[PDB]
């Protein structure tokens, strides 16, 4: 989901 993409970004 969308928050998993943030974990990737970081
Ligand atoms: C990240 C969405 C937060 C809700 C507010 C935005 C509403 C519009 C987008 C809704 C997208 C659907 O998300 P989902 O696959 O059910 O997300 C599950 C997230 N957790 C694993 C942390 C429970
Ligand atoms: C902000 C919350 C509003 C709630 C309004 C009442 C329920 C509406 C249910 C239908 C919601 C339909 O869209 P969704 O599957 O979530 O879109 C996901 C969009 N992305 C793929 C870009 C993450
Ligand atoms: C308070 C809650 C209100 C509802 C919030 C819903 C947020 C949904 C965000 C969905 C973002 C999807 O972006 P994406 O497809 O990965 O971007 C692609 C970008 N380029 C074209 C430049 C490559
Ligand atoms: C306007 C408000 C925007 C809110 C955006 C929320 C995004 C949430 C993303 C939540 C990701 C959780 O990752 P985590 O495993 O706890 O991260 C660990 C990070 N370090 C390795 C540096 C300690
Ligand atoms: C942006 C915040 C989204 C919160 C969504 C919670 C939905 C329930 C998911 C199941 C419980 C997840 O484990 P928790 O208890 O959160 O422990 C993990 C805490 N960190 C992420 C900081 C490592
Ligand atoms: C607009 C800015 C948006 C920023 C979004 C940030 C998302 C990531 C949040 C990560 C939260 C990290 O918490 P922490 O320091 O390890 O918790 C310390 C307290 N406890 C030990 C009780 C859990
Ligand atoms: C002040 C607020 C600024 C908000 C910025 C929001 C945009 C974040 C964009 C994603 C950042 C991570 O990009 P990346 O996947 O590692 O690089 C490729 C990125 N493009 C495909 C778009 C070229
Ligand atoms: C207008 C609203 C704009 C909101 C923009 C919010 C952006 C929040 C960004 C939060 C960044 C958290 O950094 P972090 O996990 O420690 O970094 C990764 C660190 N390592 C490389 C060592 C793993
Ligand atoms: C892990 C990333 C956390 C932030 C996420 C939100 C922003 C993503 C868009 C990419 C931001 C890129 O910024 P930058 O021009 O290279 O940095 C400016 C600061 N310095 C001059 C010191 C390098
Ligand atoms: C709507 C679209 C707007 C896009 C705006 C421009 C986004 C530019 C993203 C540039 C991302 C470059 O990431 P990188 O330094 O290779 O990896 C991250 C490395 N750190 C964790 C150390 C910071």
UniProtKB/Swiss-Prot annotation:
Changing residue 8 to K: Increase in antimicrobial activity and gain of low hemolytic activity. GO terms for biological process: defense response to bacterium; defense response to fungus; killing of cells of another organism. Changing residue 8 to V: Decrease in antimicrobial activity against S.aureus and better against E.coli and gain in hemolytic activity. It is found in: Secreted. The C-terminal amidation is crucial for activity, since the carboxylated peptide has antimicrobial and mast cell degranulation activities drastically reduced compared to amidated peptide. However, the carboxylated peptide has no hemolytic activity, like the amidated peptide. The modification Leucine amide is found at residue 10. GO terms for cellular component: extracellular region. Changing residue 5 to W: Increase in antimicrobial activity and gain in hemolytic activity (EC(50)=20 uM). Keywords: Amidation, Antibiotic, Antimicrobial, Fungicide, Secreted. The keyword Secreted applies. Expressed by the venom gland. It comes from the Eukaryota. A n-merization is probable. Antimicrobial peptide that exhibits broad-spectrum antimicrobial activity against both Gram-positive and Gram-negative bacteria. Also shows antifungal activities. Exhibits potent activity in stimulating degranulation from rat peritoneal mast cells but not from RBL-2H3 cells. Has little or no hemolytic activity towards human erythrocytes. This is Anoplin. It comes from Anoplius samariensis (Solitary wasp).
């Amino acid at each position: 989901g969308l928050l998993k993409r943030i974990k990737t970004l970081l």
